[PDB]
Design a binder for this molecule. Structure first.
Ligand code: CL
Ligand code: MG
Ligand code: MG
Lengths: 239, 239
């Protein structure tokens, strides 16, 4: 019947992280692995549920702890450490790589077949990680607040890229989306961008409206369609 | 085993059209109907194959004859017909509606569950037809050279809209895509736009390169992914 989950301790320098690894015990042997990067709030029920859903699709999934000590922040207390990441992208990248290493350390994971998904800040985190040249098959971002690349990033992405974007999301500027697409074009990345009408930021979270942060709202249609697009990409590229 | 096809005679004023209707004889009773609008060349093997593939998915599909007398043009001989449509959008719309009426006339079609897909000019045709307020559940455009709306079109689309766009297609301007998306936003249409990286115009046709028209090339990845997105939307909205 049910999927199983277990805590995974890992480190990034002096920071101790506690992720949660989801897999189907009913399935035997190595299988594709997915890192799930949460929203800025941190490792929360939303991210863990997405990892569970991935285990139910036949994957081994690690819900990542970016902040360390499984810390969760509310809207008020958040800028430390989110600005920490934007102001030091090398540090941000190492923290993401630590999660990918923790995934690949699990014996249920086929290390040759790994991907990453992420939500909001976690979506941005997927793209940062891909830009290091990590050996990812695919990344999928969900309402990710993507950044333009750093000098030296050109040509490094090895993964397929699917960006699922809320078409009315006020937190992501048109100019940024165009710049990122132009990077993908330049490098001939295997890329897609799916614009989801009537969707804003955090469209995948039924609690999106609970934070009192403007520009965040749930849209079940966008959640379903983006998840299906992700599922299709993984089925195409794995197995 | 195999799907079946039959010719369907219909008229738009003085113009006699000969479409081709595809269905599974193994399936009994009314089923969702799809009009397939071809590229500018006219009713050809490419369009008929897509109608066949739709019949294999459980739909009743009419490959439309826009030009009349099942006429096909090559790249050289094409403009007199095509400029005819762009210079008289009301006429273009009536010609499209005649195909939709011919579909709905077939006893295998559930008239309450109809959609339209189109390729290139046929994609543009789907959007023109939806702008009349036709009772379509969904339209899906594949490398469609979409036009901005006519004065008086606002609020009229009742269908879901999925636009599958080749991200490097030189025949469709960024400004046009942005304008169309802004119409969808304004009216709160149930819309998506899927940008397919590395794809140009006519990405769904393995013969795209055979016409000697610059900007046209096949991309099997884009063909597959756009077809899957279409199939998903139909499964979501029908049944
Ligand atoms: Cl669903
Ligand atoms: Mg490459
Ligand atoms: Mg509406």
């Amino acid at each position: 019947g049910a999927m199983t989950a277990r805590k995974v301790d890992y480190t990034d320098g002096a920071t101790r992280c506690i992720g949660e690894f989801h897999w189907d015990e009913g399935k035997s042997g190595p299988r594709p692995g997915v890192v799930v990067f949460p929203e800025a709030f941190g490792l929360n029920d939303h991210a863990k549920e997405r990892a569970r859903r991935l285990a139910d699709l036949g994957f081994a999934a690690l819900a990542a702890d970016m902040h360390g000590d499984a810390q969760v922040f509310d809207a008020a207390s958040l800028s430390s450490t989110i600005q920490g990441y934007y102001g030091d992208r090398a540090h941000w990248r190492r923290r993401a790589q630590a999660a990918l290493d923790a995934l690949t350390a699990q014996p249920e994971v086929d290390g040759s077949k790994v991907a990453a998904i992420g939500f909001c800040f976690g979506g941005a985190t997927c793209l940062e990680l891909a830009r290091t040249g990590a050996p990812l098959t695919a990344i999928v971002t969900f309402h990710g607040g993507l950044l333009p690349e750093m000098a030296g990033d050109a040509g490094r992405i090895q993964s397929s890229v699917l960006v699922c974007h809320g078409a009315d999301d006020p937190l992501v500027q048109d100019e940024t989306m165009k710049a990122v697409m132009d990077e993908f074009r330049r490098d001939k990345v295997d890329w897609q961008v799916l614009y989801l009408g009537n969707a804003v930021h955090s469209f995948t979270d039924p609690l999106a409206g609970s934070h009192g942060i403007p520009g965040l709202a749930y849209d079940a249609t966008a959640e379903a369609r983006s998840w299906t697009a992700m599922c299709n990409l993984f089925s195409e590229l794995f197995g």
